[PDB]
């Protein structure tokens, strides 16, 4: 039945696994019985039976390590106690060590007690096969069952194994020695049990002159080779020196098995020495202080005057390998060559310890000069290079390696001076010139065992020579190893490349330039000796192409060690090779997204990015141009080890090659073509390294690309991500059908390419399930399944819900089968899916000048649910596993189900999982837990985050147990509080008591430098919360740590440790460091003893970190006054004190213009200003600056010379009249007295007789007349400053005298109201315009603020409160219902700002008293005076505070410098509504005052005050959004962006003519039609639109954005109206396309408004509205993605019928999807929400939903199916215009205005997506509305639908029949009566003629312009006379233009020819072109006949003189016409003489 016995064992195995039913009361009985029967199959003796049925028992265990582990391990302990056959007991003992680390620590302590009776019987067994496997289980069992035993159980077990050293078998001697030493690593006390094994063994060799049973001598020396590796009460320093004398007697005790036993013990105690033993041998006296074949006086190891390591080399040589007479070999007959091999390796490991031994004499007393001629030294050790075999010539190859390694490190590379001292002491002649040619020879040796040992000698020896004086010989040994690259022994080639990885090839390139003979060398070569390109192209990349899997892996790790060490020539950092070595030695001595990628700005070394881009150039070249299988295969393994040490996201400029050509996608296009071949994935050793490297190269595009697969946003990048996500779902599809035996989107059935991949994952899985070996790193399926769930993770971050929404079904099925094999990184696949299913330089720079200036810059700053089946399975694993890499990834999966609020239903009835985390705190304190270190930071993050739903009272009692009762702090106690402190201090009366508890615990723990990072968090919140509490706490830790720094209790051993303590004294409050009594007693101290470098090192770190305080925090003056009092003697550490511690008509024209200028006053001002122009311009000041020039001819002289500059050439009008204006300003202030006193209208003469001078030099009625004529002068000059060149700005020296003159003209205004009357009340208006502009300029406003002008800034407050009170405040009222004058100026400004609510608001019931031309002027001037630093601190205090008890002292070197208001007053609503008024209309100042108001509002964040402070945070960001000064509502207003592009119809030669004509028409509209929100003053051409340029730039003027402004807005009215930042302007300031840190304030607001949504229904509505306004200021594609996620989870939860909340979120959700891609997963949620709200009955809900149409329709090329839902929005627009065609007054205003603005945006940009019938019918609905009456359709509805009609014509989109419908409607509206209505209709008549019988139809349009002169107001017909000169010259020739003008000039129905006189003048002088200047003459003849039929006789002669002027000579007749048309009637004798002169120069002109 021998073949019948085989079939029985194998059928029992398969019917247990295929049950699929475990933990059953039927299944429990079956597994016990037939489990003992698997080993009787092995107990039966046949190799056909023994081999077959032992691999079958391993199929049961591994399929049941998850399910039934406690049932498996109970049957198995029974068999050892049975103590069966030596074949039966053996193969069960393999099984029980591998399942020892699978037990739980709950059940472990019963398993320990039962084994020690069972583990002693198998130690007493003499079977030599049973004893072997126990030395491979007592390593594994007692390391996991180690910690659970006391001191009683482990002393019994070690007395047994020593009685197994008393046996004679060589197999049984070495298994009892490795059992004693594996326990003491894990016993209970690792250091206590090392000292106990050394006492037991030396009594077995107590005094050595005995008979010691020479088998038992070998038992004691083998337990000591295993324990000396572990020695590095304690094992004492006198216990270890008894070990060492024991062996030197036993290197002499004769045997060949006992001589070889004490020579392996000596080779290992020098390599890894115990540090107590190591100092007693190098010391000079050595053993003499601890006590208080050879034929000469050696001198034993007790003697002084020589080290014992000088002694120990004399002894091992003359007995083994040297004869004391002559340089001669010892024969191999005497000493074996196994015994001569271990004696050459012990002489080499001591020279690395004590190098002076090798130069010593062999005998101390010389040996018999009669017999021997000469005595020799120990240099005949180096004659064993010629001795025979390997490992003697190879172990004298390694004796010359560490003799050169350890002279250079002994004497610091001084091989000159150190060799002199020895030669006069021991007279040998042995230089290092006689050993390197002994080392150059063994590299060339024959045997491949001799070559392995000579190339480890160059690992030690060529980093010490090459930087030494012998670096001529040091470079040659670099050369010879390069010839050893092609020898055919696989261990010879991998110890080459480690001595080519430790090379510093920046120090190696330096020696090449110095060489001249070494480049030649042998055979006289010519050229360069290129080491670097030959050692990198022809070894390291070349040895990647080797055949062995051993040689390919070691060559990758060198390119991790070579890249920081290259030095390629001529970088833009290091230039020379001299400067290269200097930068690697100055950094040494002078100082949650997934793991793949990065979003930082990524500061990087510029020259370290250059060495990493030359090693990825030659590596992608032996992967593409390679011809072998072996070059492609082991160079995908060298690219996966770069990207885990030099990641791609950090070093992207090195990895970049090509793709996106600029954050990179480097080289990832080749490697996908390797994987898609059917050749390369068929072997799992390097297909798993090509998947970890293709996920690093598609993730470095994540900081660029992100704004199918809609989040990729780069269509050249999508096929690289479509492929891997197709490649990684077909490799989790072949790992699902393999772990479960099932026959063969992700699908590999129909591919024949991936049916080859199913036979390769099934060969590596038949060797795991058959061979039980749990602890393997390399498994190639367990290594391969780790690689393809790591990179399925990193792609899902790029994915969205819309791409994965068809695959959440797919990826969850595979992981339930992929869970059991590797659950550690199968939840890292599950941790990420839930994120994206829920949305989420020249050697003076380097050595000194670059590190010297990081020093001084930080000192000035020191002066300052398908988861429900998968989620339940992961919780059963944590209770039953034991590997603590898996316990760490399960505590992060549950901190994400509580943030993303999954309800606490994972434990539906009980509290099963939370009860198990409390028990694990029992095993850490006692220490019955194996790897608590890697779980204790993540245990405590799970616990604190649940309590916001175990409470924070209970959480902090658990952490107090670990610290005082448990292990050390730097693993357990200090990472325990990093989750608590960050989640308690950063994020009422219950919260105050728990903060006192946590600060007391750290004071017990200050000693550690990781505890000092937690305490920089504590000090930065008290400076923010409460500055009274901030200074109390920095005093308590002042007198703790400075007593520690003198007694050196502070662990500052690291340079991670000195960096934490110096950022502490900056942030510690300077009041606690201001007495220098404490810092000096902690400074000038002496430590206890400076013998040890543990204690020398902590005393010099206390002196370096309290000296960073005496340099910054206190200057030189304070420090040295103290030491005169404190007797700190300079003999503190002196050379006597430091020693005991270490041991212990040219001129005719000039006269005519004088008649109206040198006069008193005239009305000729616009006519007077033109005559001064053509004065010959070389002389203005001679003809303007005179005795009496009219100063009312000087201020309108400034306005006309600006219009020349705004278009063209520089103006002689405007340049020379800036010189005249500012000279008269100075002399009146020179007429003012010297020292100014403040004006006081209440008590004027009571101060002094200063006011006596002020009425005679200033109070003259002749000097008063100038002050309103000099007051119009400075009004027009300060306006144009925003648009003048730099020649024309006001001078800096004349800047003081324009500040002093605003003060002096506003005090002449207050001086008439007292005495005479009002000044003139136009002179009320001219004097307060000089004052409104000096407060808007950045130059003039700064001078008013300084200390010199306290009198001049408090006198504009007394005199603007005197003009506002003497006009508005009727007698017997008020406005609303230090020296004295400063606080009488400070109380004055508080009263005026409360009036802007009531008094000065434009149109209030209280505003009937102010005459409403000052409510523009006096509203802008009360704002800019309370921005002064004299005043501003008091004005922000609301008036309910001063009734309460708040009055601190002011000091700022001024009057009032009050601190800001504390939070406790703001907790009342009436007190809180008045503080928010003072901050918006007032703005802010320099940027320090912006962050003061930010901290006061957040502490407010009872629900009546939660509502009103979310609205206060909206208004603070917008004053950082303003385009000028940004924080001043006086000057400026909010920036807006046109969503209409600039036009195409301009920029042609006919098109540049289009832009001049409609410049004149639009500009006098805004003087009539518009609202002046921007403009305070009364001046005319104030056209100012704050559209910026865009990274912002200059400001765009109003004439350049001619038709940019959107039709949603009233003319010029600047406010928020939902369209401020259009998504055109998001993408080109923040480059994303699918002074305040304003970026800082917008990240903090995304965290706050999501936790309130995910609050009462009052607070639901006002939180969605604050987030839509700040959306102007989101500056990143990371920031727009978080906005869209929070708004969609609301709608499914919050009810649909909340129609306040419904109309803020439809504007909110739609502006996200525009900056985001409007993709197929985004369109279907965004398109459905716009359709429903337009059906709502709530009329302001209709209006917010229509702005969301625009942003979707605006920029993104919209999806083709979703643009068929534009006929959803097209149909709504037709229905509500036919009802609001006739009547607009009835229905609405801003529902009628916003709805016609989006009709115009469809016809231009998106024509074809709507019908052609829809375009022509929006034209017709603006006929009925624009031809309505002046009350049927309002003026605001009129002007906005009409500006959009001339937009569509300039766009070239409209048809030829569609365009002429607009032509007819514009004719009928010019003849309506209202001219502001009729000024806009004239602009439409131009554009139709400017987009286009030809002679005939143009006759009708021209005569429409001529009638508006006749009928029409003179505010209208100024516009018509500027155009019609320029208008007629362009269209039709001047023979036809001439007939209509004069016949409509001479007519009796001409109401005034005055404005018709300017029309005829500009025609002729363009007709004075050379072709038509004579045709000018013919038309003069016909018009003279018409005058003979007469007008009235005074009137008829006036028209004659105007005509001949316009047709005359050039220089002087042409300038007479404004002097002629000045006097129209009123004939004079002076009038008769002027007619004669003009028409006679024409008689000589013919």
For residue 429, give every residue at least 6 positions away whose Cβ sits within 8 Å of its Cβ, in sequence order, or none: 423
Q: From CA 1509, how far away is CA 1475, in angstroms rounded?
A: 11
Q: From CA 218, how far away is CA 216, in angstroms rounded?
A: 5
For residue 1233, give every residue at least 6 positions away whose Cβ sits within 8 Å of its Cβ, in sequence order, or none: 1250, 1253, 1254, 1257
1048: left (phi over 0), alpha (psi -120 to 50) or beta: left
Contact 1653, 1663 (CB under 8 A): yes
- DSSP annotation of 2037 reads H
Q: How far is CA 1999 from CA 38, 551, 2003, 2020, in A?
A: 133, 110, 7, 10
**Resolution in angstroms for this experimental structure?**
18.2
Angle at 160 between CA 154 and CA 166, to 5 degrees: 145
- DSSP annotation of 1447 reads -
Show contacts of 244-250: CB within 8 Å, 24+ apart: 244/269, 244/277, 244/281, 244/301, 245/287, 245/301, 246/202, 246/205, 246/208, 247/221, 248/301, 248/312, 248/315, 248/316, 249/208, 250/208, 250/217, 250/221
Greatest Cα pair distance, the chain, in angstroms, is 163
List 650's β-bridge partners, or say none.
Answer: none
CA 768, chain centre distance (Å): 46
Contact 1810, 1860 (CB under 8 A): no
Q: How many CB atoms lie within 10 A of CB 2043?
A: 8
Could you tell me the two tokens for 1180?
Answer: 């203005």
1380 three-state secondary structure: helix
Q: From CA 578, how far away is CA 843, in angstroms rounded?
A: 8
Contact 817, 739 (CB under 8 A): yes
**Length of the chain in residues, anyone?**
2046
Count of alpha carbons within 13 angstroms of residue 87, beta-carbon side: 13
Burial of 18 (0-12, 13-18, 19+ CB in 10 A): exposed
Nearest to 96 by CA among 124, 121, 120, 115: 115
State residue 571 phi and psi, 5-degree precision: -75, 175
For residue 1846, give every residue at least 6 positions away whose Cβ sits within 8 Å of its Cβ, in sequence order, or none: 1603, 1883, 1884, 1887
Helix (H) or strand (E) holding 113, with range, is helix 108-113
Could you tell me the two tokens for 593?
Answer: 């997204």
Angle at 340 between CA 335 and CA 345, to 5 degrees: 160
Characterize 1355-1374 residue by residue with b for buried, 16 or more Cβ atoms within 10 angstroms of its Cβ, and e for exposed. bbbbbbbbbbbebbbeeeee
Contact 1299, 1340 (CB under 8 A): yes
Q: From CA 1353, how far away is CA 1355, in angstroms rounded?
A: 5
Contact 363, 311 (CB under 8 A): no
1534 three-state secondary structure: strand
Q: From CA 526, how far away is CA 322, in angstroms rounded?
A: 47
Q: From CA 401, how far away is CA 414, in angstroms rounded?
A: 18
CA 760, chain centre distance (Å): 44
237 three-state secondary structure: coil
Q: From CA 1999, how far away is CA 1945, in angstroms rounded?
A: 9
Q: How far is CA 653 from CA 323, 957, 1066, in A?
A: 65, 51, 36
Show contacts of 1597-1604: CB within 8 Å, 24+ apart: 1597/1283, 1599/1206, 1599/1559, 1599/1563, 1601/1538, 1601/1542, 1602/1555, 1602/1558, 1602/1559, 1602/1562, 1603/1540, 1603/1543, 1603/1843, 1603/1846, 1603/1847, 1603/1850, 1604/1538, 1604/1540, 1604/1542
- DSSP annotation of 563 reads G
Q: How far is CA 103 from CA 99, 874, 1220, in A?
A: 7, 18, 100
For residue 1575, give every residue at least 6 positions away whose Cβ sits within 8 Å of its Cβ, in sequence order, or none: 1416, 1582, 1584
Contact 1185, 1193 (CB under 8 A): no
- DSSP annotation of 540 reads I
Contact 695, 794 (CB under 8 A): yes
Contact 728, 679 (CB under 8 A): no
- Tell me the CA end-to-end span of the chain in Å, nearest whole number: 147
Contact 738, 748 (CB under 8 A): no
Show contacts of 1453-1457: CB within 8 Å, 24+ apart: 1453/1347, 1454/1347, 1454/1350, 1454/1382, 1454/1429, 1454/1430, 1455/1350, 1455/1378, 1455/1379, 1455/1382, 1455/1383, 1455/1386, 1455/1430, 1456/1382, 1456/1383, 1456/1386, 1456/1430, 1456/1431, 1457/1433
For 1762-1892, CATH number out of 1.10.3470, 3.10.620, 2.40.10, 1.25.10 equals: 1.25.10
Q: From CA 1371, how far away is CA 1377, in angstroms rounded?
A: 15
Give the per-residue SS3 of 1567-1615. CCCCCCCCCCCCCCCCCCCCCECCCCCCECCCCCCCCCCCCCCCCCCCC
1496 three-state secondary structure: helix
Q: From CA 214, how far away is CA 1140, in angstroms rounded?
A: 50
Q: How far is CA 1098 from CA 614, 1045, 1047, 1082, 1339, in A?
A: 44, 8, 9, 13, 57
1522 three-state secondary structure: strand
- DSSP annotation of 236 reads P
Report the interhelical angle of 1875-1891 vs 1554-1561 (nearest 10°): 170
Helix (H) or strand (E) holding 349, with range, is helix 348-351
Report the interhelical angle of 1747-1754 vs 1702-1715 (nearest 10°): 10
Contact 558, 501 (CB under 8 A): yes
Nearest to 615 by CA among 673, 532, 694: 532
Contact 1389, 1426 (CB under 8 A): yes
Could you tell me the two tokens for 742?
Answer: 């099932």
Could you tell me the two tokens for 2009?
Answer: 């000579």
Q: How far is CA 1920 from CA 190, 446, 1931, 2021, in A?
A: 104, 110, 17, 18
Q: From CA 924, how far away is CA 936, in angstroms rounded?
A: 9
Give the per-residue SS3 of 611-650. HCCCCCCCCCCCCCCCCCHHHHHCCCCCCCCCCCCCCCCC
Helix (H) or strand (E) holding 1274, with range, is helix 1273-1279
Residue whose token pair is 């989640």: 983
State residue 1763 phi and psi, 5-degree precision: -80, -5
Nearest to 1197 by CA among 1229, 1157, 1230, 1243: 1157
Q: From CA 450, how far away is CA 395, in angstroms rounded?
A: 9
Q: How many CB atoms lie within 10 A of CB 857?
A: 8
Q: How many CB atoms lie within 10 A of CB 1016?
A: 15
Sign of the four-CA dihedral 789, 795, 800, 806? negative
Spell out the alpha helix ranges (H) of 130-187.
130-133, 141-144, 153-162, 170-173, 177-183
Q: From CA 234, how far away is CA 193, in angstroms rounded?
A: 8
Could you tell me the two tokens for 661?
Answer: 């050509």
State residue 1588 phi and psi, 5-degree precision: -85, -175
Sign of the four-CA dihedral 1891, 1897, 1899, 1904? negative
Contact 623, 636 (CB under 8 A): yes
Q: From CA 1693, how far away is CA 1653, in angstroms rounded?
A: 10
Nearest to 812 by CA among 758, 871, 763: 871
């Amino acid at each position: 039945t021998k073949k019948d016995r085989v079939n029985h064992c194998l059928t029992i195995c398969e019917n247990i696994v295929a049950q699929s039913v475990r933990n059953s009361p039927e299944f429990q009985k079956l597994l016990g019985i037939a489990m003992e029967l698997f080993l009787l199959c092995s107990d039966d003796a046949e190799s056909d039976v023994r081999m077959v049925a032992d691999e079958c028992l391993n199929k049961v265990i591994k399929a049941l390590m998850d399910s039934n582990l406690p049932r498996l391990q109970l049957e198995l302990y029974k068999e050892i106690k049975k103590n069966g056959a030596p074949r039966s007991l053996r193969a069960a003992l393999w099984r029980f060590a591998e399942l020892a680390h699978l037990v739980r620590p709950q059940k472990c302590r019963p398993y320990l007690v039962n084994l020690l009776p069972c583990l002693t019987r198998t130690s007493k067994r003499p079977e030599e096969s049973v004893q072997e496997t126990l030395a491979a289980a007592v390593p594994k069992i007692m390391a996991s069952f180690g910690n659970f035993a006391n001191d009683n159980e482990i002393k019994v077990l070690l007395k047994a194994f020593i009685a197994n050293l008393k046996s004679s078998s060589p197999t049984i001697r070495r298994t009892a020695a490795g059992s004693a030493v594996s326990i003491c690593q894990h016993s209970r006390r690792t250091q206590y049990f090392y000292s106990w094994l050394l006492n037991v063994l030396l009594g077995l060799l107590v005094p050595v002159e005995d008979e010691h049973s020479t088998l038992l001598i070998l038992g004691v020396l083998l337990t000591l080779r295993y324990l000396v590796p572990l020695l590095q009460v304690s094992p004492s320093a006198e216990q270890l020196v008894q070990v060492y004398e024991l062996t030197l007697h036993h290197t002499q005790h004769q045997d060949h098995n006992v001589v070889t036993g004490a020579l392996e013990l000596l080779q290992q105690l020098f390599r890894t020495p115990p540090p107590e033993l190591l100092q007693t041998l190098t010391a000079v006296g050595g053993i003499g202080q601890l006590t208080a074949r050879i034929k000469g006086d050696i001198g034993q190891s007790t003697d002084d005057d020589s080290a014992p390591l000088v002694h120990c080399v004399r002894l091992l040589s003359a007995s083994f390998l040297l004869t004391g007479g002559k340089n001669v070999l010892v024969p191999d007959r005497d000493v074996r060559v196994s015994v001569k091999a271990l004696a050459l390796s012990c002489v080499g490991a001591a020279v690395a310890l004590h190098p002076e031994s090798f130069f010593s004499k062999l005998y101390k007393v010389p040996l018999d000069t009669t017999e021997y001629p000469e005595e020799q030294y120990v240099s005949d050790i180096l004659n064993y290079i010629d001795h025979g075999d390997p490992q003697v010539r190879g172990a004298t190859a390694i004796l010359c390696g560490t003799l050169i390694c350890s002279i250079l490190s002994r004497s610091r590379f001084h091989v000159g001076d150190w060799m002199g001292t020895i030669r006069t002491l021991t007279g040998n002649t042995f230089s290092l010139a006689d050993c390197i040619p002994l080392l150059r020879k063994t590299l060339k040796d024959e045997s491949s065992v001799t070559c392995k040992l000579a190339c480890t000698a160059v690992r030690n020896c060529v980093m010490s020579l090459c930087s030494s004086s012998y670096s001529e010989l040091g470079l040659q040994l670099i050369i010879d190893v390069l010839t050893l690259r092609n020898s055919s022994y696989w261990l010879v080639r991998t110890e080459l490349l480690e001595t080519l990885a430790e090379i510093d090839f920046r120090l190696v390139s330096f020696l090449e330039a110095k060489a001249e003979n070494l480049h030649r060398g042998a055979h006289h070569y010519t050229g360069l000796l290129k080491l670097q390109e030959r050692v990198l192209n022809n070894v390291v990349i070349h040895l990647l192409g080797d055949e062995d899997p051993r040689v390919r892996h070691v060559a990758a790790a060198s390119l991790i060690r070579l890249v920081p060490k290259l030095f390629y020539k001529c970088d833009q950092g290091q230039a020379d090779p001299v400067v290269a070595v200097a930068r690697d030695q100055s950094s040494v001595y002078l100082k949650r997204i997934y793991r793949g990628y990065n979003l930082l700005p990524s500061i990087t070394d510029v020259t370290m990015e250059n060495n990493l881009s030359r090693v990825i150039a030659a590596v992608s070249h032996e992967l593409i141009t390679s011809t072998t299988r072996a070059l492609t295969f082991g160079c995908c393994e060298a690219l996966c080890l770069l990207s885990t040490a030099f990641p791609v996201c950090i070093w992207s400029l090195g990895w970049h090659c090509g793709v996106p050509p600029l954050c990179t996608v480097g080289m990832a296009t080749m490697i996908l073509t390797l994987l898609s071949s059917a050749w390369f994935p068929l072997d799992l050793s390097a297909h798993q390294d090509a998947l970890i490297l293709a996920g690093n190269l598609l993730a470095a595009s994540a900081p660029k690309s992100l704004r199918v697969w809609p989040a990729l946003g780069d269509r050249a990048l999508v096929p690289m991500v479509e492929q891997l996500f197709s490649h990684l779902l077909k490799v989790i599809n072949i790992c699902a059908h393999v772990l479960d035996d099932v026959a063969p989107l992700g699908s590999f059935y129909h591919l024949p390419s991936y049916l080859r991949l199913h036979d390769v994952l099934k060969a590596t899985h038949a060797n795991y399930k058959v061979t039980l070996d749990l602890q393997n790193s390399t498994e190639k399926f367990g290594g391969f399944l780790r690689s393809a769930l790591d990179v399925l993770s990193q792609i899902l971050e790029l994915a969205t819900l819309q791409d994965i929404g068809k695959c959440v079904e797919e990826i969850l099925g595979y992981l339930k089968s992929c869970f059991s094999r590797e659950p550690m990184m199968a939840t890292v696949c599950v941790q990420q899916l839930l994120k994206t299913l829920f949305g989420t330089p020249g050697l003076y720079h380097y050595c000194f000048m670059a590190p010297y200036t990081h020093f001084t810059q930080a000192l000035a700053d020191a002066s300052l649910r398908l988861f429900e089946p998968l989620v339940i399975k992961a919780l059963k694993q944590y209770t039953t596993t034991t590997c603590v890499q898996l316990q760490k990834q399960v505590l992060d999966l549950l901190a994400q189900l509580v943030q993303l609020r999954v309800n606490y239903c994972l434990l539906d009835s009980d509290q099963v999982f939370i009860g198990f985390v409390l028990k694990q705190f029992e095993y850490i304190e006692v220490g019955q837990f194996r790897e608590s270190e890697a779980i204790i930071p993540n245990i405590f993050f799970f616990l604190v985050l649940l309590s916001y739903e175990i409470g924070i009272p209970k959480i902090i009692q658990l952490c107090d147990g670990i610290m005082a009762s448990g292990r050390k702090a730097v693993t357990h106690a200090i990472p325990a509080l990093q989750p608590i402190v960050h989640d308690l201090f950063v994020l009422g009366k219950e919260l105050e008591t728990q903060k006192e508890v946590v600060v007391s615990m750290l004071l017990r723990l200050i000693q550690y430098h990781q505890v000092l990072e937690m305490f920089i968090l504590v000090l930065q919140q008290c400076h923010k919360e409460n500055e009274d509490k901030w200074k109390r706490l920095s005093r308590q830790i002042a007198d703790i740590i400075l007593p520690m720094l003198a007694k050196q209790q502070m662990h500052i051993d690291s340079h991670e440790a000195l960096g934490v303590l110096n950022t502490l004294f900056e942030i510690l409050a300077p009041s606690s460091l201001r007495p220098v009594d404490m810092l000096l007693r902690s400074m000038f101290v002496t430590p206890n003893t400076m013998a040890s470098v543990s204690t020398v090192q902590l005393w010099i770190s206390g002196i370096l970190a309290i000296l960073r305080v005496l340099i910054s925090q206190s200057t030189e003056d304070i420090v040295l006054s103290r030491i005169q009092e404190l007797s700190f003697s300079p003999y503190l550490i002196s050379c006597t004190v430091i020693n005991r511690l270490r041991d212990g008509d040219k001129d005719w024209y000039v006269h005519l213009v004088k008649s109206q200028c040198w006069t008193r006053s005239d009305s000729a001002l616009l006519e007077g200003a033109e005559l001064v122009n053509r004065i010959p311009a070389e002389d203005m000041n001679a003809f303007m600056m005179n005795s009496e020039f009219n100063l009312s001819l000087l201020a309108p002289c400034l306005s006309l010379g600006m219009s020349e500059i705004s278009g063209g050439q520089k103006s002689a009008l405007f340049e020379a009249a800036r010189e005249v204006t500012l000279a008269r300003v100075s002399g009146t202030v020179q007429q003012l007295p010297a020292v100014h006193h403040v004006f006081q209208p209440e008590l004027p003469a009571e101060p002094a007789a200063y006011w006596s001078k002020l009425n005679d030099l200033f109070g003259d009625a002749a000097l008063y007349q100038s002050l309103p004529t000099l007051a119009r002068a400075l009004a027009q000059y300060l306006v144009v400053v925003s648009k003048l060149p730099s020649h024309l700005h006001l001078p800096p020296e004349k800047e003081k005298d324009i500040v002093k003159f605003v003060v002096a003209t506003l005090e002449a205004l207050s001086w008439h109201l007292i005495h005479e009357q009002i000044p003139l009340s136009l002179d009320l208006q001219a004097g307060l315009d000089c004052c409104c502009l000096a407060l808007q300029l950045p130059g003039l406003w700064s001078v008013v603020s300084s200390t010199e002008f306290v009198t001049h800034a408090c006198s504009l407050i007394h005199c603007v409160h005197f003009i506002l009170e003497a006009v508005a405040v009727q007698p017997g009222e008020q406005l609303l219902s230090n020296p004295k004058y400063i606080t009488a100026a400070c109380e004055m400004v508080a009263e005026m700002v409360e009036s802007l609510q009531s008094v000065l608001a434009l149109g209030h019931k209280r505003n009937s008293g102010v005459p409403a031309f000052l409510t523009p002027l006096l509203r802008n001037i009360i704002i800019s005076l309370a921005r002064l630093p004299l005043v501003n601190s008091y004005t922000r205090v609301p008036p309910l505070v001063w009734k309460l008890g708040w009055s601190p002292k002011p000091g700022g070197d001024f009057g009032t410098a009050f601190p800001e208001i504390p939070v406790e007053f703001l907790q009342e609503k009436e007190v809180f509504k008045e503080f928010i008024y003072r901050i918006n209309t007032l703005g802010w100042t320099s940027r320090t005052q912006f962050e003061e108001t930010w901290a006061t509002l957040l502490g407010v964040l009872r629900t009546q005050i939660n509502v009103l402070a979310v609205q206060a945070i909206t208004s603070l960001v917008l004053s950082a959004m303003t385009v000028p000064v940004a924080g001043n509502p006086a000057v400026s207003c909010l920036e807006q962006q046109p969503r209409n592009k600039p036009l195409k119809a301009l920029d042609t030669r006919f098109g540049r003519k289009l832009s001049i004509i409609r410049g004149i028409v639009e500009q006098e509209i805004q003087a009539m039609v518009s609202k002046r929100e921007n403009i305070a003053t009364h001046h005319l051409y104030q056209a100012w639109d704050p559209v910026p340029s865009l990274t912002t730039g200059a400001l765009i003027s109003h004439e350049k954005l001619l038709l940019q402004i959107n039709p949603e807005r009233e003319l010029g009215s600047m406010s928020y109206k939902l369209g401020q930042v259009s998504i055109h302007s998001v993408w080109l300031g923040n480059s994303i396309t699918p002074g305040v840190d304003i970026h800082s304030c917008s990240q903090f607001l995304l965290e706050l408004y999501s936790r309130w949504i995910l609050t009462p229904a009052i607070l639901i509505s006002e939180v969605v509205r604050s987030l839509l306004v700040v959306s102007d200021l989101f500056t990143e594609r990371n920031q727009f993605e978080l906005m869209y996620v929070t708004l969609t989870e609301l709608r499914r939860v919050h009810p649909s019928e909340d129609e306040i909340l419904a109309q803020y979120l439809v504007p909110a959700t739609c502006k996200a999807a525009a900056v985001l891609g409007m993709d197929k997963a985004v369109a279907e949620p965004v398109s459905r929400l716009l359709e429903s709200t337009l059906r709502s009955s709530h009329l302001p809900s209709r209006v917010g939903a229509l702005h969301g149409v625009l942003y979707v329709l605006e920029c993104d090329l919209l999806d083709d199916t979703a643009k068929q839902l534009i006929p959803v929005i097209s149909d709504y627009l037709l229905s509500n215009l036919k009802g609001i065609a006739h009547c607009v007054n009835i229905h609405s205003q801003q529902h009628v205005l916003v709805m016609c603005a989006t009709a115009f945006y469809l016809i231009e940009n998106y024509p074809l997506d709507v019908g052609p019938e829809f375009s022509a019918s929006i034209i017709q609905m603006c006929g009925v509305m624009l031809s309505g009456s002046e009350e049927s359709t309002p003026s605001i509805i009129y002007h906005c639908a009409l500006r959009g009609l001339e937009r569509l014509l300039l766009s070239e989109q409209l048809s030829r029949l569609d365009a002429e419908s607009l032509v007819k409607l514009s004719v009928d509206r010019v003849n309506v009566h209202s001219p502001h209505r009729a000024m806009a209709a004239l602009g439409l008549m131009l554009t139709c003629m400017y987009t286009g019988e030809s002679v005939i139809v143009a006759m009708e349009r021209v005569s429409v312009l001529f009638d508006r002169i006749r009928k029409g107001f003179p505010c209208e017909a100024r516009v018509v006379a500027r155009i019609l000169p320029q208008f007629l010259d362009d269209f039709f020739p001047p023979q036809d233009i001439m007939n209509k003008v004069i016949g409509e000039f001479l007519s009796n129905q001409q109401p005034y020819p005055q404005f018709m006189a300017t029309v005829v003048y500009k025609v002729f002088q363009t007709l004075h072109s050379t072709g038509q200047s004579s045709m000018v003459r013919d038309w003069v003849m016909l018009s003279l006949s018409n005058f003979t039929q007469r007008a009235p006789v005074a009137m008829a002669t006036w028209s004659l003189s105007c005509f001949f002027v316009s047709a005359s000579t050039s220089p002087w007749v042409a300038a007479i016409l404004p002097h002629v048309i000045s006097r129209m009637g009123k004939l004079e004798q002076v009038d008769v003489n002027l007619f004669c002169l003009v028409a006679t120069d024409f008689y000589r002109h013919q």
